[PDB]
From Swiss-Prot:
UniProt organism field: Nostoc ellipsosporum
Annotated InterPro entries: Cyanovirin-N, Cyanovirin-N_sf
Cystines in this chain: 10-24, 60-75
Native organism taxonomy: Bacteria, Bacillati, Cyanobacteriota, Cyanophyceae, Nostocales
Keyword set, alphabetical order: Antiviral protein, Disulfide bond, Lectin
Effect of residue 53 to G: Protein is mostly monomeric and has wild-type anti-HIV activity
Family to which the UniProt record says this protein belongs: Belongs to the cyanovirin-N family.
Name this polypeptide is given: Cyanovirin-N
Additional detail: Its activity in situ is unknown, however it acts as a viral entry inhibitor, inhibiting HIV-1, HIV-2 and simian immunodeficiency virus (and some other viruses such as feline immunodeficiency virus, measles virus and human herpesvirus) infection and replication. It prevents essential interactions between the envelope glycoprotein and target cell receptors by binding to carbohydrates on viral protein gp120 and possibly by other mechanisms as well. Addition to cells must occur before or shortly after virus addition. Is remarkably stabile; the protein can withstand multiple freeze-thaw cycles, dissolution in organic solvents, treatment with salt, detergent, H(2)O(2) and boiling without significant loss of anti-HIV activity.
Length: 105
């Protein structure tokens, strides 16, 4: 399961806020410096940093809009059974001058 392992062929890595920057070896020699913002892939669960789960489409089926604003679907529990669920998209999706935009807690 060899996902990741950037550190093996990079150096001068550092973190500032949510951003990792490092200088990494290219396939045919030479280096490149790049950054990755970790806010979209790591989350704080009750004081513990965790990798965010796979996109919900991987573990949910039959997604649809129920009525004017609810996302409904059937999703897998940790025990791997599908159950019904819904979420009101009006909670956090706004019309900003004609375009759908997220506004989070
Ligand atoms: Na560079
Ligand atoms: Na505006």
């Amino acid at each position: 399961g060899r996902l990741g392992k950037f550190s093996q062929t990079c150096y001068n890595s550092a973190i500032q806020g949510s951003v990792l920057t490092s200088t990494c070896e290219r396939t045919n020699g030479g280096y490149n410096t790049s950054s990755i913002d970790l806010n979209s892939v790591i989350e704080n669960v009750d004081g513990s940093l965790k990798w965010q789960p796979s996109n919900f489409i991987e573990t949910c089926r039959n997604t649809q809009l129920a009525g004017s604003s609810e996302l409904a679907a059937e999703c897998k529990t940790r025990a791997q059974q599908f159950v019904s669920t819904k979420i009101n998209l009006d909670d956090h999706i706004a019309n900003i001058d004609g375009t759908l935009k997220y506004e989070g807690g």
